[PDB]
RNA sequence: UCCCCCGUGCCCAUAGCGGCGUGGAACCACCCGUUCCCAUUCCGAACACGGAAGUGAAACGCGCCAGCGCCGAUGGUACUGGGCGGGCGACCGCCUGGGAGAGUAGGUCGGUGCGGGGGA
RNA sequence: CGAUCAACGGAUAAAAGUUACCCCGGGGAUAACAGGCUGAUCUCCCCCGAGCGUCCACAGCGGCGGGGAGGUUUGGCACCUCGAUGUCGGCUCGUCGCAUCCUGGGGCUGAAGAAGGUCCCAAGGGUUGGGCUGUUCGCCCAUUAAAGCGGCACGCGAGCUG
RNA sequence: CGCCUCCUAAAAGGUAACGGAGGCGCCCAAAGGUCCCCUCAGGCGGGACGGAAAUCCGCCGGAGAGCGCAAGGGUAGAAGG
RNA sequence: CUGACUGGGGCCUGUAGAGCACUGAUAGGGCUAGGGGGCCCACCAGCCUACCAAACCCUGUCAAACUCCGAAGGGUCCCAGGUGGAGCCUGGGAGUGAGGGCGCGAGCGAUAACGUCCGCGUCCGAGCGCGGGAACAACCGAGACCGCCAGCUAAGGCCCCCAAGUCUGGGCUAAGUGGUAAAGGAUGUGGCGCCGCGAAGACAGCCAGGAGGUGGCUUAGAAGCAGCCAUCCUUUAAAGAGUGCGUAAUAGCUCACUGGUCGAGUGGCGCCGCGCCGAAAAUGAUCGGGGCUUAAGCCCAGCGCCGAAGCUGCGGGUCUGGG
């Protein structure tokens, strides 16, 4: 008896890193995601790999706009 | 309101969170009583280990 | 027919107690009202088999109210096939939807030949008058053979009836019977 | 359901909403050109120019120039200088480009 | 016998069986049925044995209604092999059946025939069962 | 300060789909031409300019309709945190807190801000 | 820039087998024996009764399936034991279970009698000799009332043989 | 035997088994940037060759298409042409 | 003061569940392409098909790698509580890196293993210190500083061993079940609910009769006891051209049925509690034993009592922190 299966890639540690109502400095990774489960918004940047991060400082503000996808905002202090 | 709280059952073998809840109320031995102000936080810890402890609202 | 059943307002009693107490927790409502209630288990069963959803059921409230109602739905203990909560639809005025039984007059010629008859929908869906509820709907299921089928469009209706399903919805079919003769192939 | 008109409109306007500078929306009817400054954070029209209101005439390009300078004046009176131009569904050309020149030369920054 | 003609995944995990029958728990098609009473699996050989038993006891007419299906691939390893080194092969296809599951609906049959037929089929199956009738409880569901 | 229209936006279908009627004062649109600006992997279809012959047919706008769609209770339950038990086992009960999805009733043929033009 | 330094955090720039001729250190961290837990497999037992059985489901049978018991097989795990628990077979000596081969008792019969079949209760006693093979096992030989099946570390090497 | 995808994996992440499935060991000078333009699959009806399926037309379609290649995530208010 | 933990609030998640909106799988129908059959058939089409069979629709289900949804929860952060052998930082020293059992959620396995592999938790390890469970590391109780010829309780017990009730009240069981196992079976028993007929008299015990042509498909010549094609009524209690013994022939029996004699329950269902069988393994058996039956079992209600190294009381020691 042999096996074709048995291999699995490494855990990537995706997900949201800072939550709403949480102070962040600019440059902090907000969401480490594949594709855009959250879209960048107010004061929120997104690198080449869809990584959302703080553009300016302040507080994180998640906001779902229904059909318009889930956005993130960095509301300044 | 205040809370006469008598630890009336061993926490041994129970989950460490429950034991830590006992320490939060400062209870250390069996038969140890503590009247403590009923705060929703303290009342939360009491609710967590209510099965391990007896409670009576005194004042 | 008029099937009366005493209705009591469950106030804050735990449903497990009432179901334990021979009481069937239910709730009666319309676009106007909504009330937590309970009944007798054995009473609701006895009437309800007579008083299937096809029929008005007058809940005899404690205050003297006699509600023309309709069992919109009933919850069942799947682990026991036992009713566990009742949905009493307060059959007020302004004609409402329900299910009416089916009076399948006659026997299919094919069924007499040896085929098997299956009733697809043994009840029908109609938004009809609260006080114009025909208890039955007959059908000519005699002129059929094995493989013949009827639909919702062929059912004739009493006055004021509104078929609330697809007219092309088949409801009665005659399929080939179950025979050991076709089992030696399978033996 | 959308149109290349509509899809173009949300296209350019998403692109320009993206930056954050005030937007210069430019509707363009067959007989008129409408232009306004808008703060997407507030959904409030700051300054409103419109060929219809000015009662202009002549070549539509002409009126686009004129209303462009008019809106430039109304805005510069309010201190608004940097503003993102929104060509909307339109191609940046002809009347719309004439208006944009009406604002750039009108003292507006873009 | 009963078996899925194809599937996204050949093998499959066993999985807990606790809980009540989610779907298929009221007499829907036939007049009588054989509802389960204890959670258990039922292979295609067992479903088939109960089916042929029912049809034989009828022996004429009637309509049999199998409201279950053996999709989950049953699995055992080769005989006398040590543990590990892959997963066992697909012995066959079973069907999970929780309590409340109305396994069988027979219609187009006299009461006594369907009753005794469902009784024999009950003996063919590995679970305590209960013959029942289509009811307003069924009609209301 | 109200009605209409035109631009925007927000809420993300209760907002849609579908059918129905309706608007040309104005706006918008359709529309008239293609010399110009510009353009077609061909085409003035589109885009672009000049324009006003006619039309709201279309579109678009508004008002009606629940057929579809979407929203959706209340109860009840699944489930479950926790504390208890039971079961040979599969698994199952009970107390406390939480509590669905489905379905039912029922509801929705949008609401909202900003700025313009018109009107009252 | 030169990597299948791919055993891919890459021991050399550079490397395969064999040992019953073996040896040392360790291990019950781990195998073969046994024991142990499970009972898949196995033996046995019941459920349904399709069908057979002139007919007649059940004298005898018992399709397809189901539910059990035992723990003697082959197995699984690796739990004691690798500063040792000697492993098949035969012999001697037994003892025990009954899921009874005969002997005892009985039921039913497709039991005329006789002979049988099946089941039930029953472990007191018995269960032969030989050929072949290391064999157990099995076949055969001649019998027998019968020529039981198993446990006892597949009993028994501080009892023997090898 | 290294890395990617999914489940396993118990609604944070991480999480084992010689567990259940597939991949990678490249490729693109455009398959990169930017501006501008367009929106698919599919279904129906009509259409010479010509079809089931070429190209064309109209009609219905939120994406079920496509997005170089595994899966997934994402995506037409584009990342698609 | 930041800790564990707790409350408030904010948000993140796709699990259980549920559902079929995607992907599949899927049972039966409608519908119907299309292929299959029959003719009509090649002049090419057309009918019929109880054939298979798209797509679609209806009803009904499944999914670890499906999700229109979706918890309970958990994660994080802010605020508050929280002074603890709490927390953080900086250094020195470690050991450990063979774990195991139990519970729960999973995988593998055979929904086997005192199995293996994970997650959450606990205990042992290291607590083989203590009470109970007879004996027993992880099951129940409970964290052993010491002493006392003190007291109160935990689980567990209170008939003797063995301390505490042959304690009290209400039931059930008769199997020593208790004090071993399943399907399946069962006039076991106790309690239920459900329906029938019950004096225009029940079951029941009896008593008395109980059919005719005679033939149908007539045929292994039995109108009825035989493979069935049948089932007119008739005889003033009306009793079927039968259930079964003789009948490839009559018999005669007996039943349903006719009433009467007795004269009150009887008849049949479903539910539940506790029981029976089902139930055979190997040295001598056994609930730990003795024994135990309105229990000394099981269930329910109590009260009291016993019961540890738990706690309390006294005394003592010692460590940290404060005076």
């Amino acid at each position: 008896g042999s096996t074709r299966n048995g291999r699995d890639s490494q855990a990537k540690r995706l997900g949201v890193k800072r939550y709403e109502g949480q102070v962040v400095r600019a440059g902090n990774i907000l969401v480490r995601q594949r594709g855009t489960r959250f879209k960048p918004g107010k004061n929120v940047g997104m690198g080449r790999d869809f990584t959302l991060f703080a553009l300016v400082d302040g507080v994180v503000e998640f906001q779902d706009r229904g059909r318009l996808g889930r956005y993130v905002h960095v509301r300044p202090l | 309101p205040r809370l006469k709280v008598k630890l009336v059952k061993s926490p041994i073998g129970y989950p460490k969170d429950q034991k830590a809840a006992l320490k939060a109320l400062g209870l250390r031995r069996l038969q140890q009583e503590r009247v403590l102000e009923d705060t929703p936080a303290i009342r939360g810890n009491v609710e967590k280990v209510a099965h391990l402890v007896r409670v009576e609202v005194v004042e | 027919m008029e099937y009366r059943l005493k209705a009591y307002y469950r106030e804050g009693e735990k449903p497990s107690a009432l179901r334990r107490a021979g009481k069937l927790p239910g709730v009666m409502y319309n676009r106007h009202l909504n009330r937590k209630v309970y009944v007798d288990l054995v009473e609701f069963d006895k009437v309800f088999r007579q008083a299937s959803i096809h029929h008005v059921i007058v809940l005899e409230l404690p205050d003297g109210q006699s509600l023309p109602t309709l069992v919109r739905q009933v919850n069942l203990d799947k682990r026991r096939r036992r009713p566990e909560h009742v949905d009493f639809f307060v059959l007020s005025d302004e004609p409402v939807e329900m299910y009416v039984p089916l009076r399948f007059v006659g026997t299919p010629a094919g069924v007499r030949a040896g085929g098997v008859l299956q009733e697809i929908h043994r009840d029908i869906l109609v938004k009809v008058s609260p006080r114009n509820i025909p208890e039955f709907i007959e059908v000519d299921v005699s002129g059929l053979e094995i493989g013949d089928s009827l639909h919702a469009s062929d059912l004739k209706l009493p006055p004021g009836v509104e078929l609330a399903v697809s007219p092309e919805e088949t409801i009665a079919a005659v399929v080939p019977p179950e025979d050991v003769e076709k089992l030696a192939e399978e033996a | 359901r959308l149109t290349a008109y509509e899809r173009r409109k949300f296209r350019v306007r998403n692109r320009i909403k993206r930056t954050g500078r005030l937007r210069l929306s430019v509707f363009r009817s067959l007989k008129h050109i409408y232009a306004q400054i808008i703060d997407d954070e507030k959904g409030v029209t700051l300054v409103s120019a419109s060929s219809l209101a000015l009662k202009l005439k002549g070549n539509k390009t002409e009126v686009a120039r004129q209303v462009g300078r008019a809106l430039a004046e109304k805005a510069l009176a309010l201190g608004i200088k940097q503003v993102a131009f929104d060509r909307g569904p339109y191609k940046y050309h002809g009347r719309v480009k004439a208006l944009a020149e009406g604002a750039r030369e009108g003292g507006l920054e873009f | 016998m009963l078996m899925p003609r194809r599937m996204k995944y050949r093998k499959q995990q066993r999985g807990r069986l606790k809980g009540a029958t989610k779907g298929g728990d009221y007499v829907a098609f036939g007049d009588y049925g054989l509802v389960a009473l204890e959670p258990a699996w039922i292979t295609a050989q067992q479903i088939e044995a109960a089916r042929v038993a029912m049809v034989r006891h009828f022996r004429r007419g009637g309509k049999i209604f199998i409201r279950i299906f053996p999709d989950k691939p049953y699995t055992k390893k080769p005989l006398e092999v040590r543990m590990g080194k892959g997963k066992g092969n697909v012995e066959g296809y079973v069907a999970v059946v929780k309590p409340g599951r109305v396994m069988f609906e027979v219609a187009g049959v006299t009461e006594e025939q369907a009753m005794e037929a469902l009784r024999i089929a009950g003996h063919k199956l590995p679970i305590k069962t209960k013959i029942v009738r289509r009811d307003a409880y069924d009609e209301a569901q």
Side-chain angles (χ1 to χ4, degrees), chain A residues 1-76, chain B residues 1-58, chain C residues 2-10 12-102 104 106-111 113-126 128-165 167 169-187, chain D residues 1-56 58 60-110, chain E:
Chain A
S2 178
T3 301
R4 296 182 65 191
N5 301 322
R7 74 187 69 83
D8 191 359
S9 66
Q10 298 298 322
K12 301 291 95 174
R13 286 79 175 278
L14 295 178
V16 172
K17 301 293 182 180
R18 300 288 184 270
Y19 293 105
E20 184 181 3
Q22 188 177 6
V23 175
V24 298
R25 290 175 59 191
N28 295 323
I29 301 298
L30 291 171
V31 175
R32 177 75 75 188
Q33 67 183 0
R34 299 290 188 269
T36 178
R37 291 174 61 87
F38 292 104
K39 294 181 182 179
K42 184 179 185 293
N43 291 318
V44 175
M46 184 175 73
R48 67 174 295 277
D49 62 355
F50 300 101
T51 302
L52 291 177
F53 59 92
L55 295 177
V56 303
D57 297 334
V59 178
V60 171
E61 176 63 26
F62 284 153
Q63 177 179 0
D64 190 358
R65 295 183 68 192
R67 68 181 176 88
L68 298 175
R70 301 178 73 183
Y71 293 167
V72 185
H73 303 289
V74 178
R75 297 176 63 252
Chain B
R2 295 177 69 246
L3 298 176
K4 185 177 75 175
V5 176
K6 184 175 177 66
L7 191 281
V8 296
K9 187 176 186 291
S10 176
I12 302 170
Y14 286 94
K16 62 185 179 181
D17 58 357
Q18 291 178 355
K19 294 180 176 67
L22 271 295
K23 181 181 285 291
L25 298 178
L27 294 175
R28 291 180 180 175
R29 287 88 62 196
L30 269 294
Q31 303 303 107
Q32 184 177 3
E33 293 178 353
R34 291 175 62 87
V35 180
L36 301 177
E37 179 61 25
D38 190 358
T39 67
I42 293 171
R43 189 173 180 85
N45 278 314
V46 174
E47 295 173 355
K48 184 175 176 66
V49 300
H51 63 282
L52 297 177
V53 69
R54 185 181 298 168
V55 176
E56 183 177 1
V57 175
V58 297
Chain C
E2 180 178 0
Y3 293 149
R4 300 179 65 85
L5 189 280
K6 68 181 180 67
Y8 295 160
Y9 296 109
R10 63 171 180 171
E13 298 84 2
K14 289 177 91 291
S16 66
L18 283 72
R19 291 187 295 269
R20 184 179 299 109
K23 303 290 93 175
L24 186 54
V27 61
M28 65 184 181
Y29 59 90
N30 59 6
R31 72 185 65 256
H32 305 289
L33 61 90
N34 188 1
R35 299 298 304 275
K36 291 193 292 182
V37 298
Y38 68 95
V39 298
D40 186 358
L41 188 276
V42 64
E43 288 179 352
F44 172 72
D45 187 75
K46 297 294 189 291
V47 177
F48 171 70
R49 295 186 184 278
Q50 298 175 354
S52 175
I53 52 87
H54 312 86
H55 294 284
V56 177
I57 296 170
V58 176
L59 288 173
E60 297 177 355
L61 275 298
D63 61 356
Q65 290 179 356
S66 298
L67 297 177
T69 66
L70 293 176
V71 178
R72 179 64 62 192
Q73 185 179 3
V74 61
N75 293 324
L76 285 74
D77 184 1
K78 298 181 185 294
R79 192 177 298 277
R80 291 181 181 90
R81 188 173 181 268
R82 294 177 62 192
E84 59 190 2
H85 177 272
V86 177
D87 298 330
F88 291 100
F89 185 76
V90 176
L91 181 62
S92 69
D93 57 354
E94 65 180 0
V96 73
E97 186 179 6
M98 67 177 287
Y99 295 98
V100 176
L102 294 179
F104 293 100
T107 185
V111 172
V116 177
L117 181 61
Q118 182 176 1
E119 295 177 354
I120 303 301
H121 294 90
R122 289 181 180 270
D123 56 357
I124 194 64
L125 185 61
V126 170
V128 73
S129 178
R131 297 177 180 89
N132 189 0
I133 299 169
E135 288 183 353
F136 289 96
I137 298 168
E138 292 178 351
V139 175
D140 187 0
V141 297
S142 65
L144 294 174
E145 290 292 327
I146 295 169
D148 294 331
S149 64
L150 279 70
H151 309 287
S153 65
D154 291 331
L155 281 72
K156 65 94 175 179
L157 295 176
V161 177
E162 183 183 4
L163 179 60
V165 298
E169 181 61 24
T170 186
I171 52 86
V174 176
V175 299
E178 186 67 25
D179 195 0
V180 172
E181 297 292 328
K182 63 189 291 184
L183 293 174
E185 62 186 1
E186 298 178 355
Chain D
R1 180 72 277 174
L2 294 173
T3 68
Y5 175 76
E6 298 172 354
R7 286 184 292 272
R8 181 170 62 249
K9 186 176 287 185
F10 289 103
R11 179 172 60 188
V12 300
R13 289 186 179 179
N14 286 318
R15 182 70 181 274
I16 298 302
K17 264 67 180 300
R18 182 63 179 169
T19 61
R21 186 177 298 175
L22 286 176
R23 64 188 294 269
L24 191 151
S25 179
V26 175
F27 183 77
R28 185 271 301 276
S29 71
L30 298 175
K31 294 185 177 70
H32 288 284
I33 186 166
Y34 298 156
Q36 61 185 355
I37 299 168
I38 294 166
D39 187 358
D40 291 328
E41 180 179 0
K42 297 178 176 65
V44 176
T45 301
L46 271 295
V47 179
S48 297
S50 66
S51 65
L52 183 61
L54 297 178
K55 272 61 185 297
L56 298 175
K60 299 176 185 176
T61 300
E62 299 171 351
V63 179
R65 307 291 301 282
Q66 298 304 110
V67 65
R69 292 180 178 87
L71 189 65
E73 299 300 329
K74 296 173 72 174
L76 293 175
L78 275 297
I80 300 167
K81 291 181 284 186
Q82 291 181 356
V83 71
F85 178 74
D86 185 1
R87 68 183 176 90
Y90 306 96
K91 192 266 192 297
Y92 177 73
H93 186 78
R95 296 173 68 189
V96 175
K97 186 175 181 179
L99 187 151
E101 297 179 355
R104 290 183 177 92
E105 291 175 352
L108 188 61
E109 296 175 353
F110 61 92
Chain E
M1 71 292 291
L2 283 73
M3 68 183 74
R5 292 176 291 174
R6 63 180 293 161
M7 73 295 292
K8 292 173 71 173
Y9 296 97
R10 187 179 299 278
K11 292 184 181 181
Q12 186 167 358
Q13 294 173 358
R14 305 176 193 273
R16 183 66 65 87
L17 302 178
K18 64 185 179 180
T21 300
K22 183 177 74 175
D25 57 357
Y26 61 94
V27 176
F29 305 95
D31 294 332
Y32 291 151
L34 183 58
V35 65
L37 296 177
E38 65 181 0
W41 291 354
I42 293 90
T43 65
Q45 285 79 17
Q46 296 177 355
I47 299 168
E48 181 57 25
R51 187 183 67 82
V52 173
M54 295 181 288
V55 55
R56 293 300 308 274
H57 176 74
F58 283 166
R59 190 265 178 279
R60 295 293 178 89
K63 181 67 182 296
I64 300 167
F65 282 154
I66 298 169
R67 291 177 66 189
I68 65 170
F69 183 78
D71 58 358
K72 185 179 178 69
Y74 185 75
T75 297
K76 184 175 181 179
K77 294 180 72 67
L79 293 176
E80 296 181 355
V81 301
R82 285 180 176 174
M83 297 299 103
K85 293 183 184 293
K87 187 176 178 67
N89 296 116
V90 171
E91 306 297 331
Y93 293 156
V94 306
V96 175
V97 173
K98 291 186 180 182
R101 182 71 172 173
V102 174
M103 299 174 70
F104 285 150
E105 291 183 353
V106 297
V109 170
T110 65
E111 180 173 2
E112 62 181 1
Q113 291 180 356
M115 295 301 291
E116 177 55 25
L118 296 178
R119 190 183 67 80
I120 299 171
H123 288 283
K124 298 293 182 184
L125 294 176
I127 65 171
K128 289 186 181 293
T129 64
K130 178 178 73 175
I131 296 170
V132 298
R133 179 180 299 106
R134 191 189 66 254
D135 293 330
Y137 297 100
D138 295 329
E139 291 179 351
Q141 300 298 320

